[PDB]
Amino acid sequence: MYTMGLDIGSTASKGVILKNGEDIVASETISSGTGTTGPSRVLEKLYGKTGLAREDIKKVVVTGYGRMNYSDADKQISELSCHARGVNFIIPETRTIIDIGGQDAKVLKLDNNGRLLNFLMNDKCAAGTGRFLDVMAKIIEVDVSELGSISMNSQNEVSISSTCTVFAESEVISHLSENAKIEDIVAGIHTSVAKRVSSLVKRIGVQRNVVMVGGVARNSGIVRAMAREINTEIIVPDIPQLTGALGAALYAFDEAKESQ
Amino acid sequence: MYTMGLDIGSTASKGVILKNGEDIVASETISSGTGTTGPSRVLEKLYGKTGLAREDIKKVVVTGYGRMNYSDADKQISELSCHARGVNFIIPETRTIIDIGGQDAKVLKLDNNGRLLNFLMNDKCAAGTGRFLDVMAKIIEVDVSELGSISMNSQNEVSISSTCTVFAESEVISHLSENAKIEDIVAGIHTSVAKRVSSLVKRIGVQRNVVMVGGVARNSGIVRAMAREINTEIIVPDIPQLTGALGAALYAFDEAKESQKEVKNISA
Ligand SMILES: Nc1ncnc2c1ncn2[C@@H]1O[C@H](COP(=O)(O)OP(=O)(O)O)[C@@H](O)[C@H]1O
Ligand SMILES: Nc1ncnc2c1ncn2[C@@H]1O[C@H](COP(=O)(O)OP(=O)(O)O)[C@@H](O)[C@H]1O
Ligand code: SF4
Ligand SMILES: [Cl-]
Ligand SMILES: [Cl-]
Ligand SMILES: [Mg+2]
Ligand SMILES: [Mg+2]
Ligand SMILES: [N+]
Structure with missing residues (x-):
């Protein structure tokens, strides 16, 4: 399965495509944040790298400062929660x-x-x-x-x-x-x-x-x-800037299981 | 008698020449502070405009960030004290x-x-x-x-x-x-x-x-x-940017009167 996490900060937009809740098959960062073409271009690129389309995404969650001024996502979740989730997924006893x-x-x-x-x-x-x-x-x-x-x-x-x-x-x-x-x-x-x-x-x-x-x-x-x-x-993880979007994708994976 | 006050801040240098502790005869602000050519050009403008020279100035006081680093004045005094003195001179009950x-x-x-x-x-x-x-x-x-x-x-x-x-x-x-x-x-x-x-x-x-x-x-x-x-x-006084220099010039006047009082003048 595939899930998506988007982290739209006021400086940059970050996207991850997660596989079966454990494998990132694409990640992307655009140095334009909330209220720009940031989010748009991010999706554009993730769809490219993996060769997938919106239909293929079982669940998407958005986080960051721009999450609310954005439709449509399944859930919008605090970036505090999303960073914690993403970090804990990579580094234990954090x-x-x-x-x-x-x-x-x-x-x-x-x-x-x-x-x-x-x-x-x-x-x-x-x-x-x-x-x-x-x-x-x-x-x-x-x-x-x-x-x-x-x-x-x-x-x-x-x-x-x-x-x-x-x-x-x-x-x-x-x-x-x-x-x-x-x-x-x-x-x-x-x-x-x-x-x-x-x-x-x-x-x-x-x-x-x-x-x-x-x-x-x-x-x-x-x-x-x-x-x-x-x-x-x-x-420091190797993908420090993307731990929020990773966390959001993992909450997306949670959601996908929940809709068994 | 004339006294002089110099207020050297980190942004601007300000000078005042005060006559007999009462009349500002020259004032000058230069938008260069410590430590630029600012203080020097303030002096040029005060002397130039009054035709006076260092010799005609009985006491000089310097204040502001850069008062230390300025040699030489008869005294270097807190800018807090100098602004207070200058303001109180102009505006009572402050x-x-x-x-x-x-x-x-x-x-x-x-x-x-x-x-x-x-x-x-x-x-x-x-x-x-x-x-x-x-x-x-x-x-x-x-x-x-x-x-x-x-x-x-x-x-x-x-x-x-x-x-x-x-x-x-x-x-x-x-x-x-x-x-x-x-x-x-x-x-x-x-x-x-x-x-x-x-x-x-x-x-x-x-x-x-x-x-x-x-x-x-x-x-x-x-x-x-x-x-x-x-x-x-x-x-706001007429000269809000110059109150520190004015305060300094007034303290210089205090010094001048003080030294006049440690001597006697005997004439016939
Ligand atoms: N390749 C890089 N190397 C070092 N710093 C970077 C790099 N790319 C971005 N940054 C820094 O990261 C900041 C944005 O980080 P980010 O966590 O995306 O902010 P936000 O989440 O608030 O949008 C930028 O201010 C920039 O200073
Ligand atoms: N004519 C003016 N109108 C408005 N602001 C001024 C004027 N002249 C100077 N300023 C501002 O006053 C500030 C410097 O004030 P001053 O009390 O001389 O600083 P300092 O004593 O710390 O050197 C500067 O930031 C300057 O831009
Ligand atoms: S808030 Fe911080 S950075 Fe901004 S002006 Fe004050 S000290 Fe400077
Ligand atoms: Cl100025
Ligand atoms: Cl002024
Ligand atoms: Mg962020
Ligand atoms: Mg000042
Ligand atoms: N960035």
Whole structure:
């Protein structure tokens, strides 16, 4: 059988096609989010890779910030639930999940069943989110996808003193003007983000296993800096940005069984 | 006698030459702060315009972020003290001072002698400061000096839901694309700043007279929105951006009189 999960965030749209409730036969990410052609183009592509059509999908569930402004799905489910489901499907004994997306950072604490025990989120400040990195990458004139590997070359990381995205940009521009090494600039950028998010994590208390998901988790530099700041191993799946859409597809699989 | 006050902030450098502790004979703002060529060009303009030279100045005081790092003045004094002194010189019975500058906002509560009783400051976040306005003005393609007049024509403010400068910027850009009325976009911008600064005022407790100073107080749209948010009349001096330099020049006058009093002058 096939089920579908859609995760339409305010920054990107994520889709997964799941097989018999255990095999992803296609996944897709479009860097356009809620209220764009994001969802449309996502389906388009999944149908391509697998060669399937809407008829072939027994159940579809949508999650993320745009789930409600979207018809038609069978269920619309909280992205907190969907990320937890997807992560637990890949990584067992997960007790802390750190979701860093385009415009917010979330920390979930789970009980031994994968159910939510506690939760903290920054969604008011652009620092410590993907927007911080997106702004900086545009200032440094590289794609966000390169930052992880660029920072790997850093030998004398440049500190950013400002926690504010706006004041930090001014510091980075200044560093750029006096020819600080780009790799050292990026290293300090990664550290600013990790400092912000790790403070969130320390408030709820780290409990292993700690897993990072979200688009920003694709940035290996951020993951390293986070592991440094919280002083705990961090497990990252190979499909960090897609754990929400995976979770939604698994709730879809639940639904399909339910309609035996 | 002449004294001089210099207020070197992180955004702008301001200078005042004061005659006999009473008349401002020269004033000058240069939109470059610490540490640029800003202070030097302020001095050039004060001296140039008065034909005076360093020698004619009996005492010099420096204040602001960069007072340290400025050699040399007879004294370097807190900008809190300097704004309080300058404001009290101009506006009697002042009990609350709101200083909105390029990168922070401060609220001072003063006692009946003009002494600091309480204090709150946002200096970590660009929202609710001149930087927020500077960023938005760039986006809407208007000079920051034009914002006040534009906002006067607003009849239906376009509200900004985000408190963050970066997220708010995206909302404004969206409004511009939807061809929202510019005066209503600007009014919403002014309202965002006022909500964030007025929260400081309310925590400290408004006490009349309320005075706004700082370069952002030159934006009458910000002043109107502030008065609305705190539900109190706000007085703005003629020279809101220069009150720190004026306070410094007054402390310089105090120093000058003090040194006159450690000597006797005996004439026939
Ligand atoms: N290849 C990549 N490498 C590093 N970071 C990325 C990559 N692709 C996207 N991102 C980051 O992920 C963010 C969006 O992540 P996502 O979890 O999709 O957000 P949302 O769920 O809120 O839409 C973007 O801000 C971007 O910074
Ligand atoms: N004529 C004006 N109208 C509106 N805003 C102004 C005007 N002149 C300066 N500003 C704003 O005032 C701010 C600087 O204020 P100021 O009190 O000098 O800062 P600081 O003391 O921290 O250097 C800047 O953000 C600037 O854009
Ligand atoms: S600190 Fe900077 S990034 Fe955080 S909310 Fe304030 S303006 Fe936005
Ligand atoms: Cl200025
Ligand atoms: Cl002025
Ligand atoms: Mg998300
Ligand atoms: Mg100042
Ligand atoms: N993305």
